[PDB]
């Protein structure tokens, strides 16, 4: 609901609050926003796999209210949409990039683990059985 | 005090001043926005009320160093250019966010409009009033008079800043004084 | 619609030829001592008698609290469900059905409708509480302003294609939110947006009070040619739209007398 | 150059914007030009009780006319397609449903 | 907060804002909505896990929702409940990236059965004992 | 949302830079050990003084955890719907999203996690039989066999 | 005296004088507010009847110091900068509110408009009248005349301040004079 | 911060401030575009937070070099002039795109409007507002006042740049100082 | 006429003959101004002000 | 970038800026024509990005020497006047098109408006806007301000050109340096 | 000196250009002077 994975024109079906909130990935490589332009709100044209990841900033409020400023009903909706989207990428698992504590998952197994190479990485039993 | 400065700006426009806080129909919000912008711009340069981070040794695991949220400008005490990126310290010349050694930096923070000296507050209020008058009622003799008043208050602020920081000759004369003893 | 006003010496002071739009096709109409009756084509098998006072949305020092909403009908909403009145059950116009307060201090504020079922049972948006509201059709009121032409010292018009309009200032009293569209074919300008004069920390903006401003000067920016600009103000809502004066800023070169 | 439109209460004009009389508008819909309050949105159409007269198939087949009878009145209503006349009170109440 | 773990019918104490948001689990088995009924706001007639809606805002003011204090409080309560939900781990269902534990230990990991599953230390020690 | 640093032994003043909404929302950790509120006091808004100076140099951690019990501003019971009230109410949610993203607030998952073919890197060595293991301890098993 | 200042301000505009201060006249309260603002702005700099040298010790075991008086500016006699946060003493550079030892400082208190010297009161009243006239009726010859009158009263106030504070050559001449004795 | 700059630009014209950036207001997008143009034009010259010294080697056997970063200007530390054609490095004088050895160069990167120092951001915002006012409402006293404010913020930015970059007499004095040691 | 919302009224001077004391109320909804007071033109030491 | 400069020229005229490329009804074609003419005129003089034909030995059978198509000005390194005629090298003083020996010439080429440094591009855009404004809306204060902005950008361009070409004293001091060693 | 003709909707006039009423034209052929749209070409003649 917050990320899309799919040769010059790329469509953007996921909603966003700003164009700069969308990061484009080609073969798990990030592309700077200076290398492509937005033809429309649902079309990205490159200068010359495709993954789109949204990441709303969490340092500033998107809509700042000021005393003596014009107000419309949609301002509250957009302000709420900011937190809604933030929770969306929180759920999709593409936002959290690590942990700083001990996970206490009670009697549940983790699936689809890539084989580690650095001996500090975790290991699946696809290698344990081979060793055994 | 903020309502007082908003009333200063309203008086500069010739409109009736308000008493209730930010619950007024007339476009006094421009006064608040201009006041905030002017205060940030004026406080951007280092004044006598600015903090210092004498030593912040980073933890090797994350590698990043937190900076005060209300910071405005940062100057490294040593010969390094520093700035803010995503709320942490940033190396401009190296384009990196990680640090392995201690950093001694001088940082300028932002101050709320009810928590700053009287002279600086009056200067900010008068500058905001002058800017709002220039935007709305044009550039006439009233704008020049408001600019002169703001300049006088800025001079008083400079006097206060020089009083608080005794900027005498105590840099190279220290060697001569030590030689004499 | 024709509006007339005869002044002194048999001089027509006002002549108006605006147009009105009704949800249903009209069959006949006739006026009375105070009101004009409209007979429209009912959605069922009977004609409806619509009455209106031509100058009715004016109240002295109290403002018009009744919603701007055609063919109102009291409706009780419970559990987010209410049955549409029989005279409003016209196929194809379900998107034009509105809902608004008409009793409390929030009178005139519109309420959303999620969908209308085949059996004409309407589901309201989750935010709508339970109570008595008004159900009826919604009419779009709009106006296109004549572009501000420039006159010289000798009261003569200036040639077209050389006077650039900068901005349009509209003063409005007791109005809600309007939609402003600026069209200029000769310069390929098409900007559609909404402008509201309700201030943030003002007494006008309250949780229960309607979203209206006692006085508001919305500034419409349109850097186009004043010869062919078409600025229009419209709102398809239950709130009023009152325009008093329109102020413009032009930009012309005085290169020669 | 600063200015202000002289008036807005005049009606719609299809002329070019150059040679338009003051106050005339390019296009006006569902609005009332009240001099005492400026340009205003048209008032809503309050609904009177639905008459028992059937819909006329032809778009132009209904004839209506108010008749004042002393302090009270009547609303003559005739369906030209079938000839079924109808008489209503001052506000949506049939008195004698005249036969066709 | 988000979840509570407890023949009778049921008993709920979880603060919610819509009946459909409450999911009924017994012995870690999902129960369809048609298999139980909501006789009261605090009772369920025949482990309770809450999952608030995520696709759309609870109160869309633009669409025509009533502007009152109650609607504002309910809209804020939606985010409060969602943030409460996002801390007990009942919502996250996988990471699309290289998770880093940076010197920390995963506790209570269970033994896997699919060769693409994580491993605990019990079976590692079992292998270490020939 | 949080800050970690290594301070010399004998330091009592701790300076915070986290923009908190309440003083009770700031948690002080010394050497990954939670410090009770009775062991330190707030000299000012951005200064924490320890009752007893640190005996030895250690890491100071200043995690913030927003109290997600009730809405900070309840509109139906007296809030005036003004600029600062809305700003604080939205700031609460913004802060909560911040700590949730930083990843120091999640303690465990009650479900089957799915890394989807991505390694769980930098995993510490297990100490308990139920704990997970890394490739480092698989090296000993490979060598012994 | 305050009523007389408000009457001077009203006379500058040309309105009707008031005989009952704290009335309901819209321009009466405006004059009082402008007078208060001008007075607070102008007394911020140290004068002979504003500056008092005081030393305050933290009453409890080393903690906060609640600042007394109606302070306007607060200079530090020692090498530290002082502020005023939440009504208590605050170290601007150290960002702390708790002090261990006694602090010596020179504080500029605020003086009510009824109890200040005649020249200073006249200067404040005329400056307020000039500011109000500039904001209301625009900048013209009347504004310049009012500014000139205010400047003359400012010169008188400066003369009074210099007379009551003997500022002679008694800084380094003490060393060259005590030796001759 | 960008919304604040756009609001400053709108205030200069006298229009209505916006609270939601990336809206449909015709003048909102104009302000953002003018701000971006002014920022790119002004950051082209080297500052302390723009200039980074980097060396890039042709990754394959001697060929083209794809230039990273959001470069604005590109000076060459060696005796060659560099350009940027089709997103890769280009030798302006040699008219070639393939390099044999590693190249050392000083590149001036571009900085987004949300992550630059306060003084520089204020200068950019006020210059954009002055330019927009000049283009829209013509050159008058308001334009000169806005230019003066922009110049003051430019002076503040120059002070910050000179403070963070220690520019002392340390070019030839090293030869005359190391010999005395 | 000039457009509304840009002309600021400063003061109102009313000349009155053989009048007593009147109550003046100034209302402005668009600017939240509500001042109610009384104005009298009887001078202090004039022949108009006498005990009888 | 070309559309950005066209929008700069449109803003200078006070008209609404465009987004679509060269598909606009208003007379923005004059902006493009003036931009091209100004760019060619400015680049006519030698700048730091200009090529050199070190040696082109002609084939005796045709006798003619080809020159770059996008050339603007040519200077012979030796004492010969050169120019273009029918796309080949031409001898001005000899009025001949054939050559028997090698030629060392310095040639200035033309650069597309999306392929030149930022400062020069901004200077060209502002000069084009000023020229278009002078042609259309007359010579008022706006024209003077645009001319000043163009002059500032030209100064920045000169700074960049002097930075890229180190024009120190290394012409006659080489003899002294060689004598010292 | 800059200017603009007051009107073009008046008919043809054979007078000298000096003493011509505003709007009158020197010669007009196959054109319609519609006030609502300015000077226009005459409509074609449809054939019955």
Automatic annotation (TrEMBL), chains B, G, H, J:
This is Putative tail protein.
TrEMBL record, chain D:
It comes from the Viruses. This is Putative tail protein. The chain holds residues 5 to 104 of 778 of the full protein.
TrEMBL record, chain E:
Residues 7-88 form the Bacteriophage T7 tail fibre protein-like N-terminal domain. It is found in: Virion. Residues 105-130 form the Trimeric autotransporter adhesin YadA-like stalk domain. GO terms for cellular component: outer membrane; virus tail. Signal peptide: none annotated. Its main location: virion. Keywords: Viral tail protein, Virion. This is Putative tail protein. The chain holds residues 3 to 147 of 260 of the full protein.
